[PDB]
Structure formats: C-alpha cells, structure tokens
Amino acid sequence: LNCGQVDSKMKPCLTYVQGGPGPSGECCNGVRDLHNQAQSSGDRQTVCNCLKGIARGIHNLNLNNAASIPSKCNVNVPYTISPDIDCSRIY
Numbered sequence: 001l002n003c004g005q006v007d008s009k010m011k012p013c014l015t016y017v018q019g020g021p022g023p024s025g026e027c028c029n030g031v032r033d034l035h036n037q038a039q040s041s042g043d044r045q046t047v048c049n050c051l052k053g054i055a056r057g058i059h060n061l062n063l064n065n066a067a068s069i070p071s072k073c074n075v076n077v078p079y080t081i082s083p084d085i086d087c088s089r090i091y
C-alpha cells in the first residue's frame with residue numbers, strides 16, 4: 001500500500017495521538033481499510049514502517065490514542081499507530 005497513502009490517511013488521527021480533538025470515526029474506518037487491504041506481514045510491513053515513520057516523526061505520540069484506535073475501532077490486532085510496533089513479524 002504506497003506508504004504516502006498510509007501517512008496521508010493517518011495524518012489527521014496523528015494530530016489526535018499528539019493532541020487532536022479526534023478521532024472522527026474516519027480513522028477506525030480508513031484504518032480497517034488498510035487492515036483489510038493489507039493481509040499478510042509483507043504488505044503490512046511497508047505500511048507499518050510508514051505509519052510508524054510518522055509516529056516517530058510526530059511530537060509526543062500519546063500511547064492511548066494509538067492503542068485506542070484498534071481497541072475502539074474494533075480491528076482485533078497486534079499493531080496500533082505507534083513508533084514502537086511489532087511491524088517485524090506481525091504474528
């Protein structure tokens with residue numbers, strides 16, 4: 001999934017993880033799309049590395065916001081918009 005997408009999608013929610021008046025539902029949804037489009041470790045990797053990339057290239061990512069997204073979005077998974085994910089294997 002062409003990285004820039006990931007970022008261009010995550011970006012408003014990123015505002016949320018740093019201190020945004022989010023999320024608007026959009027995240028949960030767009031997120032699932034990347035989680036539905038990406039299926040096995042290999043597609044996810046590129047994307048995770050990019051979403052992570054931004055998590056890293058933010059100010060003070062607030063763990064909650066991030067974990068929260070799968071937690072409330074209901075995307076039953078190991079990763080959630082962070083700098084330190086299991087992007088590695090994802091299994």
Ligand SMILES: CCCCCCCCCCCCCCCC(=O)O
Binds near residue numbers: 010015
């Ligand atoms: C494992 C690859 C990660 C990206 C694709 C899987 C979905 C990531 C789950 C977190 C979604 C983040 C929502 C937008 C960013 C944010 O909440 O600030």
